[PDB]
Design a protein around this ligand. Structure first.
Ligand SMILES: CC(C)C[C@H](N)C(=O)O
Ligand SMILES: CC(C)C[C@H](N)C(=O)O
Ligand SMILES: CC(C)C[C@H](N)C(=O)O
Ligand SMILES: [Zn+2]
Ligand SMILES: [Zn+2]
Ligand SMILES: [Zn+2]
Ligand SMILES: [Zn+2]
Ligand SMILES: [Zn+2]
Ligand SMILES: [Zn+2]
Ligand SMILES: [Zn+2]
Ligand SMILES: [Zn+2]
Lengths: 484, 242, 484
């Protein structure tokens, strides 16, 4: 019928037994001490992230899963740059919820564990799974807050997690289904359901050609799938003339590499080469659901990178919207090409800040893996705001260098103004970022390379195996704090 | 109490049984750059007669293939008793450093700083733009960072997260594995491996693989081995003595 | 204190509820129906291989793990060539035992589940783990039969499984510890503890040179680790003159490939390139513990294959004990070289049958993976005996062709009588087997290529991740049936 997830902390030295949360101690009382008695009989105490299931304790809750929360007073961890307490909660709740799902129970009530937003994030992120195309599926579990106190915190958590889950769905979906047009239509419907203060323009190829986006066009032409330039507006500020914050996302729905073709091994993961677009767009949908009082513009060039009789050829020279020429030495370095045009266009909105996200380089994954998103920025103020936000969400960011040293390696070019791959193979993520800087004149610009946090195997406990949707929540948190 | 410096001194790295490719392998004669930089820094500090006690430690050897070489899968015991599964014999720097770092604790040092031309991943990460610094002390990071601003031989901080430690302690046969479960974040997992041999509150690991050579990036250095970041190390010691 | 593992079958159509085993129904009675009541409350029924834990049902058994046994009347599966019932039991019991271990309980009593030997095999194979070199270890669990009926079947199972576990330990152990000498000394002590009717000779290099084993010597010389030729005798027949069954095993303690050097990726697994020697030797130890009334001889050439200033060089020609010359075109095809000499020597015992086992070719893994061991034999009688035995143990065998078509590809040789790698890359396991046949004149010879069943990830439910020790039990079963 209905399941229940309860938390218990690790025992502190001067305590006689590990302490339950408020909901845990109360439940124990409701069942006349039966919960504590059975936990004692079952064996060793529960450590952070571990779970244990007890049956028949109450007629309304035939299955009760107790989860280990770790140390009660865990706050900000200086070594890890995150709030440890929140991370323990998200992981423990996800584990509890999955045990309830394995038991095939359709609904679960969750202990707020001293921080309802984090508990909600663990349940919602933890239970997610993309199974639309399978006949064999797990039971759909409805998770709700146990109790009626602090409902707003719980709901804030569901909102944040739902935002990241949308990014995951968009990324996980096979490319033949998640085409440039389909992605745009899904985002449009999600933003419009979130708020009536929105405008969406799924700009077609003719518009792209009118905007002189020759760099973006050179990439798209190799494929038979039509390209689109997604532009979204969220008018949340009281003053309509208030300059917007602009977000830009790389939307390659599928990257085969083009003529500079990729190796077969694990190339299926390239259906998520639109993760940049998925994360910034989901962040705008959430900000819109939250009705944040700020104006926001989202831009996402979308297309496929395929080999054919009309594809980009190594050595070809293309002209960006701003007139700069680019020598396309490697057709698989296509993200920086489409972003050159999107970033130029971003300046037309005379924005307050410009933030782009992209699953850009294999070098970023080699650099930091899934530990943190790499952030390249010309503004320490901006770096600090993103960093602070990440400490709260736990979806970490780490700063990478924007030095002229790297710019030199991309402007040293045989045929044009700038080369799309550096002279050397060293510092791939840094030279890619340097390339993007040639298309930015704004004082507050940040580039997020999310190639390393594209997927999850088991690094983040509360995310099942698959596309991660990172760092959506950090983006939402940043916008939230910015609006205040 | 002395400040202790540790340097990887592989005079030549062929890779061993997990043999390297021929292309540009000659550059591996500089796989002792860690030892060269910390030792030169101590020589300079000594010429300057800085009023501080300093200890320098450098394990030195060659990594070659032969009838008695390390074999993939072999398990070895570090000075501190921890066991290590040698899955890849070319990840030899972390092996020699495990013992040198354990030994460093015997001097009951104020700080521990090691330098090593450790991973190809560091070069892929930052190239010759800056030396990667992994540290459990923000105070220490700040002192190294400030020094680098003055010398121009830049440093950039890299993450020491438990996330990476998990990938090296997940080991089939022993306490710790000498290469991670995945190929991602090579420099971070190597640093995590080293942390298992450090209990000191002020330790910094400098991966200088990317600043090993100079083609033309640093205008004032001709083509060849760079000797970076020696001056940043000297500046750090100078400021520390004052 | 003490744990209990009980089995339950899947419900048959005309039954009202799934049926417990005899021990399960009795336990339920002891606790006045409390087990059935709690299982009913907990949810969905237990399917094959699944488990569920119940706490506080009895003061002597604070943790009771019920395991799904599948269909009660599962017998020989014609599609799978095995006894399905036994496989369900082994897997279910292993799962139950591991849950008890995770709970950190030092001892468990196990339900015989209608077949005590299979239940014992699941518990013993299931709990095994090589952790001698780790500081962090799981609790040591002592598993015993629940009840006192059919103790001989239970013990037979512990014997068979212990035999396979020894092969696993020998294979898993790092090569710097598991050297040719060390392997020989460990086997010697195990055989001698098993029976006083044994003789072991750890033949040194000088003996190998006297026996004119130039092929085996060419492989060993590249390494600084001394080679040994292990010879073991088990005199179990009442008639000492009774011709022995001879077993031969490839004992490469570490295979780097030599001058024809292997790639770095996963080369650590080559510490198990002595699996052939480990399996035939463990089989002889078990047969000896069982005091089977048959004479058996075990032969295992042991050495390392390393690159150095004195290693085998591609193109070198070496002379086998029987005088045939071999062109060593690829130094990584070293197993067939050492086996040429061991097989020649095997004929000196004027054996009844000759069985060799070897982790010989990557081609065998590509051919059948871990599904079955490949068997090449010139005797259909012998094939049938091995096949029948495998149906009982579940550690399957599959016949591979010994055709002259393959022999032609190895005798077509530029410089010598036979080439150590075929003219073409096709049918690697078949040409390797053809090569071995040139050193065999016996009418009942079987070659077992176990390269594909060297390791286990999760294919065999009851074996944890690591070296598998397959197909030891099939070898023991064969010897058992042969003695009767
Ligand atoms: C690893 C990937 C993120 C590579 C990236 N798709 C590049 O455009 O090919
Ligand atoms: C690129 C190099 C610094 C690699 C490093 N010598 C490792 O031990 O093989
Ligand atoms: C895959 C392996 C079983 C290969 C085998 N060791 C050969 O001698 O190299
Ligand atoms: Zn997709
Ligand atoms: Zn690409
Ligand atoms: Zn791409
Ligand atoms: Zn190396
Ligand atoms: Zn090295
Ligand atoms: Zn071994
Ligand atoms: Zn070989
Ligand atoms: Zn071999």
């Amino acid at each position: 019928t209905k399941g229940l997830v309860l938390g218990i902390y690790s025992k502190e030295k001067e305590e006689d037994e590990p302490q339950f949360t408020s909901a845990g101690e109360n439940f124990n009382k409701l069942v006349s001490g039966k919960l504590r008695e059975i936990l004692n009989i079952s064996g060793p105490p529960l450590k952070a992230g571990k779970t244990r299931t007890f049956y028949g304790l109450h007629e309304d809750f035939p299955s009760v899963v107790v989860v280990g929360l770790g140390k009660k007073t865990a706050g900000i961890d200086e070594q890890e740059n995150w709030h440890e307490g929140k991370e323990n909660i998200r992981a423990a709740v996800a584990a509890g919820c999955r045990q309830i799902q394995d038991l095939e129970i359709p609904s679960v009530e969750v202990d707020p564990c001293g921080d309802a937003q984090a508990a909600a994030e663990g349940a919602v992120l933890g239970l997610y799974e993309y199974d639309d195309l399978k006949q064999k599926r797990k039971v759909v579990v409805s998770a709700k807050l146990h109790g009626s106190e602090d409902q707003e915190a719980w709901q804030r958590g569901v909102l944040f997690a739902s935002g990241q889950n949308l990014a995951r769905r968009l990324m996980e979906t096979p490319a033949n289904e998640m085409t440039p047009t389909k992605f745009a239509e899904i985002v449009e419907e999600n933003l419009k359901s979130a708020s009536i203060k929105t405008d969406v323009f799924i700009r077609p190829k003719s518009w792209i050609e009118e905007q002189e986006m020759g760099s973006f066009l050179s990439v798209a032409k190799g494929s038979e799938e039509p390209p689109v330039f997604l532009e979204i507006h969220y008018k949340g500020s009281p003053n309509a003339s208030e300059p917007p914050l602009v977000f830009v996302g790389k939307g390659i729905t599928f990257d085969s590499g083009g003529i500079s073709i990729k190796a077969a091994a694990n190339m299926d993961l390239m259906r998520a080469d639109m993760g940049g677009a998925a994360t910034i767009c989901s962040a705008i949908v959430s900000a819109a659901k939250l009705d944040l009082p700020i104006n926001i513009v989202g831009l996402a060039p979308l297309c496929e990178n395929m080999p054919s009789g009309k594809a980009n050829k190594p050595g070809d020279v293309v002209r960006a919207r701003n007139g700069k020429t680019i020598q396309v030495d490697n057709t698989d370095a296509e993200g920086r090409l489409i972003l050159a045009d999107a970033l130029c266009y971003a300046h037309t909105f005379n924005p307050k800040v410009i933030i782009n996200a992209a699953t850009l380089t294999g070098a970023m994954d080699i650099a930091l893996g899934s530990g943190a998103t790499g952030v390249f920025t010309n503004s320490s103020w901006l770096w600090n705001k993103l960093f602070e936000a990440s400490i709260e969400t736990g979806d970490r960011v780490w700063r990478m260098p924007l030095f002229e040293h790297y710019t030199r390696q991309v402007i040293d070019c045989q045929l044009a103004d700038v080369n799309n791959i550096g002279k050397y193979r060293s510092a791939g993520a840094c030279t890619a970022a340097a390339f993007l800087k040639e298309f930015v004149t704004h004082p507050k610009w940040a580039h997020l390379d999310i190639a390393g946090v594209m997927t999850n195997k088991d690094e983040v406990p509360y995310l099942r195996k698959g596309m991660a949707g990172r760092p959506t929540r950090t983006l939402i948190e940043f916008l939230f704090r910015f609006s205040q």
